[PDB]
Amino acid sequence: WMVMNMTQNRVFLRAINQFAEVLTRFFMDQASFELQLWNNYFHLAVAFLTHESLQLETFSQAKRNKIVKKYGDMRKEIGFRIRDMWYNLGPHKIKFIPSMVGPILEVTLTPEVELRKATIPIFFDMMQCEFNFSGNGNFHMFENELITKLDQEVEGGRGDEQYKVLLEKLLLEHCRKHKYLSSSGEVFALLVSSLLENLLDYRTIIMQDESKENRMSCTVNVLNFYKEKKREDIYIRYLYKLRDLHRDCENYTEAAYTLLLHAELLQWSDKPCVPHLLQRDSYYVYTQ
Amino acid sequence: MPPPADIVKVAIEWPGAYPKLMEIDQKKPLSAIIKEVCDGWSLANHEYFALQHADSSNFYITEKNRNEIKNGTILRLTTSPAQNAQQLHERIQSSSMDAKLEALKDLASLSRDVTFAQEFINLDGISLLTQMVESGTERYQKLQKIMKPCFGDMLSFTLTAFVELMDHGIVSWDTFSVAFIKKIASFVNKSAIDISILQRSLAILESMVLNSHDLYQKVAQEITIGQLIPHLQGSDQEIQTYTIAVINALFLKAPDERRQEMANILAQKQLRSIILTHVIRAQRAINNEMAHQLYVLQVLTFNLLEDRMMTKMDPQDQAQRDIIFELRRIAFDAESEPNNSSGSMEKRKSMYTRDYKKLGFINHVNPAMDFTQTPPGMLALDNMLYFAKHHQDAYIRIVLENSSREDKHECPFGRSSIELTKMLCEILKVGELPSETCNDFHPMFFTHDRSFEEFFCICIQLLNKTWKEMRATSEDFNKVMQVVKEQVMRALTTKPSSLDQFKSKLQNLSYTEILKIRQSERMNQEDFQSRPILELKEKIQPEILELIKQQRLNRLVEGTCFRKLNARRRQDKFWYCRLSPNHKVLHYGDLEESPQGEVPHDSLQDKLPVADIKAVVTGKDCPHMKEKGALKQNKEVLELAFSILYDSNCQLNFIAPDKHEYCIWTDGLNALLGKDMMSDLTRNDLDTLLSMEIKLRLLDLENIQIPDAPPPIPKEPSNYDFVYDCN
Amino acid sequence: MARWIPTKRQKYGVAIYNYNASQDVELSLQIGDTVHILEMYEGWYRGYTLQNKSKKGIFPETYIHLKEATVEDLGQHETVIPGELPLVQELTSTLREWAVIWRKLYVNNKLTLFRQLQQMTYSLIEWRSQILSGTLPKD
């Protein structure tokens, strides 16, 4: 009952729209209390947004024609509502960061272009807000998990290259819209795009015949990016994958090299404060 | 700049002498051409020579038809027409019988020209012929019993000459005498004449009928219905056509009362029955002239109905009141008591209004107002008379049915009958002159002398049944008219044989099954071979074969259990040859017994260069089957032979289970070389794929004829000016 | 190619056979090549072919069967019987889907289901040809 599904989604869109309108009607800056509900609000919005997409209907063009004839695309206005709500919300983006980093990724890597084109400036807005918050130091603590979630998204099978080109064009435009921080923003975004094409090559070659050299170059590039950004979680998991693949190809010298990399990026502190270095396959004491 | 055409080549032949070449210009007058010919050939007496065409026409050169002259055409010189006429006249009274025979034959053969006929008649030829015919009555009697065949042939030629002269109309109408009519009558009276003589006599009779009307009365004075029926007994179709045409001529310019009288004579002799048992049951080459005979006899029946239906039935006729009273008595003896027959007219008016308020009649004071419009007029009255006479059970059922209509959709019988009569008159083209080219014939008109009434009865019964099934309303009059027109056209196109069989076939016909089967047969024939249809499918074959080869490669990728050679002494017989997902290398070798199928792993021989494979030999050319020691293969596996030849010294010979997968494997091997398929399975799939695709694409042309000739290319403006913006 | 006028009485652009390659945009057109034409000319029609709706194709008037019928066949009284030609157009959509159905049914061998699908589609096209013209009672 796909017609039932789409009517249900249409009424869900109506309900979300009226929720947004009542929130704008009585939950402005004066209602600065209990602002945590917006986290679940946007989580629900993104979960609703992440289905019935282009690839769902891509099996036959007739389905796309009929859906745009009777209802039209809904994810577009979903993104429009999300972006206008983010614009009109306020300067309280600091508390959103650790929660908003994940969900915005799915709309970030959308197969379409126009909605992503209109949605891109939210990244510039959040970057400038993050600088305003973190001028008393650095602001890597967004790009770290941004890269983490981008890697997860590409591992889910949603990477693209002309989208990378569009991203680079838009971020160059936004850096030209900005000041000396444009240099740091653009170099970090260049790192992001290089890592994205890295994972694009990884995914487009993991399905083709095995070659075992381009994947190695891509993985060592991700390791370089992670050690450049002072991030080890994705770095340690990817060197684990490297070690597994090298066990598959009985190459002990590179395995020893990667083990030395892990050892040198592992401190002598004996208290497992950060549990990311452990393995989630089993559950025991796991003392370091 | 076209080259000049003033120079032409033409050879003028002679009887017994070879031709001579000269250039002839048709623009100049014939006198100048003759003078130039005489000057060139040094021939005197230019007025004693002429020109003629040596083609099949064998005609002389005429001012109106001289364009038939073409270069490289045989032309022979002949004697001048004046000399030919003079010698024919001299040999008319010659002493040689053979000379007379050949002269008359030549004159009859060469009597197809009008101007030369005028020239011949200018010499009092008609008067001489009339005098020799009048004086020759007793002259040929002595030698009639000796040379009847030749005399009859010459008489037939003379009759043909007279017929063509009459067709040209050169002979005056007043010049005709009663002597010719008497001679024709005497020829008819003879019982020892041939069929050809009879055909010529009947043609003369019909021509004379076409000439005037009093001569038609004179010939009808010697016409009996009992002599033209033996003519039908002859199985020849041409004599039947001639006799029927003369019969129609009897109905052309005769009084309508005499038309009815002779129609009654035909009915009492039951001519249509013997016609059915003679010409209808004949399965010979039916003539288009016979089709014209059928059409004109149909028109004659229509006129014999019209001359009695064209008149208006006076509503003031008390005899008409009594007739309709008896008709409604014998029709409505369920609601009307039998006692009103001897009753008064007040009960008559009460019955009128009570039985016409349920039959869709507005006026109840003057019920005969609807009888002043013809067609049909009184024809519906005769139809209801016949219904009461023969269909009394159905008549009573209809009477009790129409009055019982509780759907408020009672059909007015009079209006429906008038509409159906108008539609029949329109479709049958009543009131128009006979066509000179159309030859449509309906063999159902000869089943009965009243065949039109029977056809109308069948039509109205079918319409009543169809309306009862549909239970139609007042909003589909156009639908009713179109459906009845289409069903009548479909019934007439079937050429029925008998009324009962025709009525049965009316219901037996499916819902346009004939059209669908004809379309399917035409499509199949076009797919087999056609100029404007067959090229369409073979023009576009880039994707079907590519996807077929892709499917074969996928079959190679999935793979199955293969077989080895000479597995007799502790040797495995099941293994796998799996194609790589890159479709470049083959994984194969000696494997174990795996009932499940292929085991995904690296086999013994993991490499098979496909870029160096020469070909795959199929049949008895396999080197492994040519063993002369102990590894000889069975004769029953000859259809399972295929070897991938490579390195010119080693062979990889595989064994197939049966024929279909052997063909699949050879198709895959040939697709690897980018060649055609060699599988019975593929050809089975090849035909249905193209057929299914064409079946899918023919939807747009449904209900539309597809022209065969390429459509023309109308001119287009040179400029690309867009009044309406693109995109 | 001038004097092109917007029109909506040509949504059913009927081809004849493989059109000549005199025009570069034009190829060997198939039988069921409906052109959604948006421009009008006396003897030529250029519009979007169904195979490539983003590519224009100029088709002569003699190559186009005049079809004033639109998608809605009741506004212009095109229906032989009201409320039936929507069925024929949804059946055309169903067959355009059958296209990709058979295009995909060969990648994976579904021989029993494929054969029964063939029989069903054969009956379907038989019934479509039978009801190409509506001349039967409503039942």
Author numbering:
A (entry chain B): 1006 to 1293
B (entry chain A): 1 to 727
C (entry chain B): 1 to 139
From the primary publication:
The DOCK protein family activates Rho small GTPases through guanine nucleotide exchange factor (GEF) activity. Herein, we present a new conformation in which DOCK5, ELMO1, RhoG, and Rac1 are aligned on a plane and symmetrically flattened, as revealed by cryo-EM using a lipid membrane-coated grid.
The human DOCK5 and ELMO1 complex, along with an upstream signalling factor, a constitutively active mutant of RhoGQ61L tagged with polyhistidine at the C-terminus, and a substrate, nucleotide-free mutant Rac1G15A also tagged with a poly His-tag at its C-terminus, were reacted on a grid coated with a lipid membrane [67PC/21PA/6PIP3/6DOGS-NTA Ni (mol%)], followed by cryo-EM data collection. Reflecting binding to the lipid membrane, we observed approximately all particles of the DOCK5•ELMO1 complex, appearing S-shaped with an extended longitudinal axis, in a uniform orientation. The ~7 Å resolution map, particularly in the regions corresponding to the armadillo repeat motif (ARM) and DHR-2 domains of DOCK5, exhibited sufficient quality to trace the Cα chains. We then modelled the entire complex molecule using the reported structures. ELMO1NTD, which interacted with DHR-2 via the Ras-binding domain (RBD) in its auto-inhibited closed form (right), diverged from DHR-2 and expanded along the lipid membrane surface due to the binding of RhoG to the RBD (left). ELMO1CTD, which is tightly bound to the SH3 and helical region of DOCK5, also rotated along with DOCK5 such that the variable loop connecting strands β1 and β2 (VL1) on the ELMO1 PH domain was oriented toward the lipid membrane. The basic residues in the C-terminal region of Rac1, which interact with these acidic lipids, play important roles in downstream signal transduction. In conclusion, the extended-open form, one of the conformations of the DOCK5•ELMO1 complex on lipid membranes determined in the current study, revealed that a major conformational change accompanied by interactions with acidic lipids is required for efficient GEF activity of the DOCK5•ELMO1 complex on lipid membranes.
